[PDB]
């Protein structure tokens, strides 16, 4: 524990650009896709050892078995192991999420005391990419599934019906209560933790205003401390919607199983995508 | 094109490793018979017969071979020209490639001595 502590705090005041934390999550998520990418072992089922949702698996599978129609069917509709339809959906989610990272609001700025340089301040919707807000959505549902162990004495059944996703590709699986409450909690949790999150880790209305005055950048349209009212009609909604249509987006990470690991993989690669911007910044 | 070179070096350890033992396939490593107490510890590379291998023996051999060759590729492609960062990047390149070269040949020398029992 102390080692992960030291490695994280020597990658905030040290190198630190992404974090220590978020890039650990990102690389371990790269690995959790990657064990699904090439997969050497399979404990043998009723047929077909040593091929579990790899593309090598779905290239060794063409070398073993005849009747290539039922070689296609096991390649594209594999259930218990990872699937390649799963991998298409996984790729698809990556493409859409980088479609939505580029959602940004532009605001041009006359710098103070210099004639007409326009380094337009942007506001991206992902809005720190919600490394708070998803992990806000994750770790409360991790701390109880820690503390259900104290529920064994004094459970994985009746407490689960408002605890977890319903895990079923069948959209009309046997409980709509769990599905509705899970999705509504996901959406509301990320939106609510946006509208509560922005007030602490920067980039709220006064935060942006004092950083821009602090770096001598004034909006053209009006006076310097009306910049607040220039942009206070963006930041909460681009918190809240910026919360909301991530979690529903992770709904599309679960509703369709195109995710190697789900929600978390969408969002740790979102960490990476913001991370590339941070590294590029210093060129 | 150089992609043909990529294809060939891809094929290199692929047919150094186990195309010979695709049809004669011998499963990865377990052969101990309790040795005095503990039953089925997986042993090693095969040692007593020379021509045989397992899957785990062959892949390791192939990996050892192509990293050495592509280390020499890296010596050619960047270390002899003089264009990039002339004190930081270059020194890394000769450093890790010399580490590749020396420790690779050393370990492959070990992995012929111990399966082979050759007088060194």
């Amino acid at each position: 524990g102390l080692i992960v502590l030291l490695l994280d705090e020597l990658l905030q005041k040290g190198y630190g650009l992404g974090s220590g934390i978020s890039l650990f999550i990102a690389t371990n998520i790269c690995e959790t896709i990657v064990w699904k990418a090439f997969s050497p072992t399979t404990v043998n089922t009723g047929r077909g050892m040593e091929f579990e949702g790899a593309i090598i698996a779905l290239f060794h599978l063409l070398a073993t078995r005849t009747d290539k129609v039922r070689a296609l069917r096991e390649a594209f509709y594999r259930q218990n192991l990872p699937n390649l339809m799963n991998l298409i959906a996984t790729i698809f989610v990556f493409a859409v999420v980088i479609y939505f990272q580029g959602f940004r609001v532009d605001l041009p700025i006359k710098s103070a005391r210099y004639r007409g340089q326009y380094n337009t301040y942007p506001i991206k919707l992902f809005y720190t990419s919600n490394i708070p807000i998803i992990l806000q959505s994750a770790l409360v549902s991790n701390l109880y599934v820690i503390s259900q162990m104290l529920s064994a004495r004094f459970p994985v059944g009746g407490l689960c019906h408002y605890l977890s996703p319903p895990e079923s590709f069948g959209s009309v699986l046997e409980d709509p209560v769990h599905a509705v409450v899970y999705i509504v909690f996901m959406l509301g949790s990320c939106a609510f933790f946006s509208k509560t999150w922005i007030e602490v880790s920067g980039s709220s209305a006064k935060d942006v205003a004092k950083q821009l005055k602090e770096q001598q950048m004034v909006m053209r349209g009006h006076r310097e401390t009306s910049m607040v009212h220039e942009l206070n009609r963006y930041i909460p909604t681009a918190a809240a919607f910026g919360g909301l249509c991530i979690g529903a987006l992770s709904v599309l990470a679960d509703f369709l199983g195109a995710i190697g690991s789900g929600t978390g993989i969408l969002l740790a690669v979102t960490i990476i995508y913001q991370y590339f911007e941070i590294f590029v910044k210093e060129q | 094109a150089m992609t043909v070179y990529a294809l060939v070096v891809v094929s290199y350890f692929l047919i150094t490793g186990g195309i010979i033992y695709d049809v004669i396939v011998e499963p990865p490593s377990v052969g101990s018979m309790t040795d005095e107490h503990g039953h089925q510890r997986p042993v090693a590379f095969l040692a007593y017969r020379v021509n045989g291998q397992y899957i785990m023996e062959g892949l390791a051999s192939s990996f050892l071979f192509t990293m050495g060759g592509l280390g020499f590729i890296i010596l050619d492609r960047s270390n002899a020209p003089n264009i990039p960062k002339l004190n930081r990047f270059l020194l890394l390149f000769i450093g890790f490639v010399c580490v590749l070269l020396s420790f690779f040949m050393a370990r492959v020398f070990m992995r012929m001595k111990l399966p082979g029992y050759l007088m060194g």
Partner: peptide
Amino acid sequence: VGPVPVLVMSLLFIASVFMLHIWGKYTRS
């Protein structure tokens, strides 16, 4: 890390795990 021992410290910790893992397994089989 003004110093690199923190890394070395981590390496020491892995070795302690590495060696101490098989060290008790020495007497077993």
